[PDB]
Amino acid sequence: GAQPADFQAEVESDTRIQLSWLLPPQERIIMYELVYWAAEDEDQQHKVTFDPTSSYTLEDLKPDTLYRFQLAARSDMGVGVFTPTIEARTAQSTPSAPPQKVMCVSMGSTTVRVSWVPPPADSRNGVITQYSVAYEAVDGEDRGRHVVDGISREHSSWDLVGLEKWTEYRVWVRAHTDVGPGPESSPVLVRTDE
Ligand SMILES: [Cl-]
């Protein structure tokens, strides 16, 4: 079939982009071939073939990723040439994995230093914009969770202050993008001095 006309891409979400084009005039269209790839990894292309239609929503894409697309039409006369490339970028998401390497060390009777590294690069789904640290006493009177947020992305540690003396705490660390919070780490236990 003829090169598809008015081929366009619309971002729908962090994982979905809708492609659309014109139905070809007076052609016995049989199927379409959609070739797509991430701009950052142009050696890895994907093709999906499908029955005739004028729109296709690609799903399960990677968040915050610039994608490129080309479309070809197969008619009873065979497959034609591909469209020029078009592009669209999926939205960001929240992180899909916690901060890694979480450690806690007592720094006195009422202070604990929490340290971490960012979640793996492929699970950030956007630029990491803040961290939060949650803590909860294991024993003692206040058994509630307390959360410190707004920790800037350049921090790799944070001091929890004002804790109770000789008290054990659970500590969890969580990453955020502009979209919102990701999951928190598995808890690390730490006890204050004296
Ligand atoms: Cl929390």
Curated annotation (Swiss-Prot):
Chain segments carrying region Disordered: 182-194
Compartment(s) of residence: Membrane
The Fibronectin type-III domain, residue ranges: 3-93, 98-194
Top-level taxon in the UniProt lineage: Eukaryota
Subunit organization: Interacts with GRIP1. Interacts with PPFIA1, PPFIA2 and PPFIA3. Interacts with INSR.
Annotated disease: Aplasia or hypoplasia of the breasts and/or nipples 2: A group of congenital deformities encompassing total absence of breasts and nipple (amastia), absence of the nipple (athelia), and absence of the mammary gland (amazia).
Family: Belongs to the protein-tyrosine phosphatase family. Receptor class 2A subfamily.
Function: Possible cell adhesion receptor. It possesses an intrinsic protein tyrosine phosphatase activity (PTPase) and dephosphorylates EPHA2 regulating its activity.
Protein name (Swiss-Prot/TrEMBL): Receptor-type tyrosine-protein phosphatase F
Organism listed in the record: Homo sapiens (Human)
Top-level taxonomy: Eukaryota, Metazoa, Chordata, Craniata, Vertebrata
